[PDB]
Design an enzyme around this catalytic site. Structure first.
Site, PDB file in Angstrom:
ATOM      1  N   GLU A   1     -23.122 -54.346  68.249  1.00 33.18           N
ATOM      2  CA  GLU A   1     -23.708 -53.288  67.443  1.00 33.18           C
ATOM      3  C   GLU A   1     -24.184 -53.875  66.122  1.00 33.18           C
ATOM      4  O   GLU A   1     -23.582 -54.810  65.589  1.00 33.18           O
ATOM      5  CB  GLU A   1     -22.704 -52.164  67.184  1.00 33.18           C
ATOM      6  CG  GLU A   1     -22.454 -51.268  68.382  1.00 33.18           C
ATOM      7  CD  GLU A   1     -21.576 -50.078  68.047  1.00 33.18           C
ATOM      8  OE1 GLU A   1     -20.758 -50.186  67.107  1.00 33.18           O
ATOM      9  OE2 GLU A   1     -21.710 -49.034  68.719  1.00 33.18           O
TER      10      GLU A   1
ATOM     11  N   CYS B   1     -34.225 -56.434  56.927  1.00 37.77           N
ATOM     12  CA  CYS B   1     -35.657 -56.179  56.989  1.00 37.77           C
ATOM     13  C   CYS B   1     -35.891 -54.686  57.171  1.00 37.77           C
ATOM     14  O   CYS B   1     -35.270 -54.055  58.033  1.00 37.77           O
ATOM     15  CB  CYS B   1     -36.296 -56.969  58.130  1.00 37.77           C
ATOM     16  SG  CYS B   1     -36.049 -58.753  57.988  1.00 37.77           S
TER      17      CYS B   1
ATOM     18  N   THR C   1     -28.116 -58.079  71.558  1.00 37.54           N
ATOM     19  CA  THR C   1     -27.830 -58.817  72.782  1.00 37.54           C
ATOM     20  C   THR C   1     -26.356 -58.724  73.146  1.00 37.54           C
ATOM     21  O   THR C   1     -26.009 -58.689  74.333  1.00 37.54           O
ATOM     22  CB  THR C   1     -28.247 -60.284  72.623  1.00 37.54           C
ATOM     23  OG1 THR C   1     -29.659 -60.359  72.384  1.00 37.54           O
ATOM     24  CG2 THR C   1     -27.900 -61.092  73.875  1.00 37.54           C
TER      25      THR C   1
ATOM     26  N   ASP D   1     -36.306 -64.116  74.276  1.00 38.44           N
ATOM     27  CA  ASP D   1     -36.141 -62.669  74.152  1.00 38.44           C
ATOM     28  C   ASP D   1     -37.235 -62.069  73.275  1.00 38.44           C
ATOM     29  O   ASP D   1     -36.962 -61.214  72.427  1.00 38.44           O
ATOM     30  CB  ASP D   1     -34.762 -62.336  73.577  1.00 38.44           C
ATOM     31  CG  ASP D   1     -34.364 -60.888  73.806  1.00 38.44           C
ATOM     32  OD1 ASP D   1     -34.907 -60.260  74.741  1.00 38.44           O
ATOM     33  OD2 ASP D   1     -33.497 -60.382  73.060  1.00 38.44           O
TER      34      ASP D   1
ATOM     35  N   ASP E   1     -30.193 -61.360  56.371  1.00 39.65           N
ATOM     36  CA  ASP E   1     -31.048 -60.694  55.400  1.00 39.65           C
ATOM     37  C   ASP E   1     -31.689 -59.473  56.047  1.00 39.65           C
ATOM     38  O   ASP E   1     -32.191 -59.546  57.172  1.00 39.65           O
ATOM     39  CB  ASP E   1     -32.120 -61.651  54.889  1.00 39.65           C
ATOM     40  CG  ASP E   1     -31.661 -62.454  53.692  1.00 39.65           C
ATOM     41  OD1 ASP E   1     -31.076 -61.859  52.760  1.00 39.65           O
ATOM     42  OD2 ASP E   1     -31.890 -63.680  53.684  1.00 39.65           O
TER      43      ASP E   1
END
Ligand SMILES: [Zn+2]
Ligand SMILES: [Zn+2]
Lengths: 319, 48, 255, 31
Positions: free
Chosen positions: A25, A95, A22, A138, A93
């Site tokens: 980077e 994923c 949003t 979002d 964390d």
RNA sequence: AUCUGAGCCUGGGAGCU
């Protein structure tokens, strides 16, 4: 210049870029000493017009509050030493997967049971953040993560905020222009500013359809184009199907196609096949937000309690 | 000085500006005009 | 022991970052009270919520448990803290407006600097820097719980009069301005101390409920009357140094 | 479910008495 | 006669080491 409660991000080693967020980077990184994987989300203080962005302050607040098995976990917030300025990194964390990537990969095959489980974890997350008075704002396939162990995590709360059930009186005027156009519900496109949790469940319906279509179901190019696509698929926006939609200043100023009948099940039959699945998608893509199904009703829907029962993802993920 | 219902969301809370402007009189009425007056006039704390 | 991070013992408070640089306890407490007063003034001119001011004050109190007043003056940190709290508490104010109000407050003689002058853009750079330093010093822990929430809830529960509610809330604000209880005792405990003090002042007495429990038992399970009176004594002790003009202006003039 | 607060005619509590002799009668500051 | 900051208050400043 003392700073005991904000470690330098140097403790992590960046490994690769993984998309544009949003407001920043995002990099995959590992702790230099322990090897713990994290996601570094760089706060892009380009908007130096108001100093530190309120969007990031909200994200930090919300992620310090929300703690759930299906909500992404904020570990800490790190800084950079003034070189030639400083920057802040949100440390999440890591994923392994994101839903969009899985849906684009042809070797990944979902069983109906696994789709049921994905939607179940998704709606658990939406239920949790909604009961904590947080809107995501979002919802999209790329913001739904799945860990190596098949645990779904809602992510990218940069656009989220708290909301009120206030108060049988002065209504809220939230930020209207939110949600990626493809997953944006009708009310936002008609200029609604007193909206609520239902907008997130619209995205859930769109995401649930992608579980079978493997491609966003309404790929509009403008807000008007998107509204037209919605009318084409879900039926025309009319007071008959959406009481008091007249009151929107732009309801007639925008001219919405009037003939279209509802074709959600008609058009999705070939992809979804399962009857209960189609019904739940039909209830998720209702035009009038006052009638759209909510997380709890969705989670009690027969889709989640009929055979085949939901199963763990670990199987499907290894391909 | 004036209580505020905590169940209100942060963007709903009323503003703190008192209805009347702060004076320099130190009479009873003026020492409890607002928090600023109380801290400065009644309790004598000033930054300048 | 992560709770006790932003809550301190008297041994920890005595060895403050300001003590490290030779600053008398009373002088640090004074700088704190002044910062609180300045925050309240700026907040009232900006017309922000009391919640914003209270949050800014807690930020200031915690900021100066890590940094020293030697390095960061209270009159420079305070506008940054308030500017940040305005965002945190969902009532953001334009940076221009804040710098304007701060100048008005700190330089009533000088004219509000031009929005183009190099000195104004320097004030902006300084404010944004201080904001980043406050954020990093606090570890981005921006969710603050205040005694006012529990004070108001309790006054509603016990069916207190308008005057007793006003006074309890007023004492809660005074607790944030004048003491460091926010760094010593949890918001519920301070709320109880505040209601107790307002009652002792007003001579209101809150009875026992229909189910036989004292009112403070419905706010925090650790508040014993012994520790309640002890912390009320600590409050009044922190208040003894106040230039008690009241004992003197008590009976003189009207408008 | 909670009896309204009730005054204490002529309070004697050392804490209350010291606070009041300090401040100056709560009934007065109503103005 | 001018500067400085400091501490004292008192229907509030052009009062005092
Ligand atoms: Zn005032
Ligand atoms: Zn007056």
């Amino acid at each position: 210049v003392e700073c005991p409660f904000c470690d330098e991000v140097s403790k992590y080693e960046k490994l690769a870029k993984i998309g544009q967020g949003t407001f920043g980077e995002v990099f995959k990184a590992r702790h230099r000493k322990t090897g713990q994987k994290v996601a570094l989300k760089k706060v892009l203080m380009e908007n130096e017009k108001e100093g530190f962005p309120i969007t990031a302050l909200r994200e930090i607040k919300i992620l310090q509050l929300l703690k759930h098995e299906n909500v992404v976990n904020l570990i800490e917030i790190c800084r950079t030493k003034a070189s030639c300025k400083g920057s802040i990194y949100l440390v999440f964390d890591f994923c392994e997967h994101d839903l969009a990537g899985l849906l684009s990969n042809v070797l990944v095959k979902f069983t109906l049971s696994e789709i049921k489980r994905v939607m179940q974890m998704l709606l658990n997350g939406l239920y949790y953040i909604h009961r904590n008075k947080i809107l995501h704002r979002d919802m999209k396939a790329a913001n739904v993560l799945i860990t190596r162990d098949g645990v779904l995590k809602l992510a990218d709360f940069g656009l989220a905020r708290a909301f009120s059930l206030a108060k049988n009186s002065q209504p809220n005027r939230y930020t209207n222009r939110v949600v990626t156009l493809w997953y944006r519900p009708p009310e936002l496109l008609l200029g609604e500013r007193d909206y609520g949790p239902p907008i997130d469940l619209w995205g859930a319906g769109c995401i649930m359809a992608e579980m079978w279509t493997r491609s966003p179901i309404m790929q509009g190019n403008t807000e008007q184009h998107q509204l037209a696509l919605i009318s084409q698929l879900c039926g025309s926006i009319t007071p008959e199907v959406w009481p008091n939609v007249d009151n929107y200043e732009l309801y007639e100023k925008l001219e919405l196609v009037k003939g279209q009948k509802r074709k959600v099940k008609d058009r999705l039959k070939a992809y979804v096949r399962d009857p209960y699945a189609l019904d739940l998608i039909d209830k998720l893509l209702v035009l009038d937000p006052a009638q759209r199904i909510d997380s709890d009703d969705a989670l009690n829907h027969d889709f989640f309690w009929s055979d085949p029962m939901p199963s763990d993802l670990k199987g499907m993920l290894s391909t | 000085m004036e209580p505020v219902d905590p169940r209100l969301e942060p963007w709903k809370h009323p503003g703190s500006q008192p209805k009347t402007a702060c004076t320099n009189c130190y009479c009873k009425k003026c020492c409890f005009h607002c928090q600023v007056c109380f801290i400065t006039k009644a309790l004598g704390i000033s930054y300048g | 022991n992560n709770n006790k991070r932003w809550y301190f013992t008297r041994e920890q408070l005595e060895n403050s970052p300001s003590r490290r640089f030779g600053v008398d306890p009373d002088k640090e407490l004074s700088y704190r009270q002044q910062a609180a007063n300045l925050l309240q003034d700026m907040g009232q001119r900006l017309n922000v919520s009391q919640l914003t001011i209270n949050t800014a004050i807690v930020y200031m109190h915690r900021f100066y448990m890590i940094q020293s007043f030697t390095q960061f003056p209270g009159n420079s940190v305070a506008p940054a803290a308030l500017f940040l709290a305005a965002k945190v508490e969902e009532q953001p104010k334009k940076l221009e407006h804040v710098i304007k109000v701060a100048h008005t407050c700190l330089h009533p003689q000088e004219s509000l600097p031009d929005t183009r002058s190099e000195a104004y853009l320097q004030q902006v750079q300084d404010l944004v820097i201080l904001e980043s330093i406050i954020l990093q010093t606090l570890g981005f822990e921006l969710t603050i719980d205040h005694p006012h929430t529990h004070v108001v809830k309790c006054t509603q529960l016990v069916r207190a009069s308008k005057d007793l509610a006003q006074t309890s809330y007023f004492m809660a604000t005074n607790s944030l301005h004048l003491t460091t209880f926010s760094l010593q005792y949890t918001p519920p405990v301070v709320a109880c101390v505040c209601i107790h003090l307002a009652c002792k002042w007003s001579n209101w007495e809150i009875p026992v409920s229909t189910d036989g429990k004292h009112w403070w038992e419905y706010v925090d399970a650790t508040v014993t009357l012994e520790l309640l009176d002890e912390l009320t004594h600590e409050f009044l002790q922190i208040l003894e140094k106040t230039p008690n003009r009241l004992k003197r202006i008590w009976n003189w003039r009207a408008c | 479910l909670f009896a309204e607060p009730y005054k204490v005619t002529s309070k004697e509590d050392y804490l209350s008495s010291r606070i009041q002799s300090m401040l100056g009668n709560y009934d007065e500051m109503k103005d």
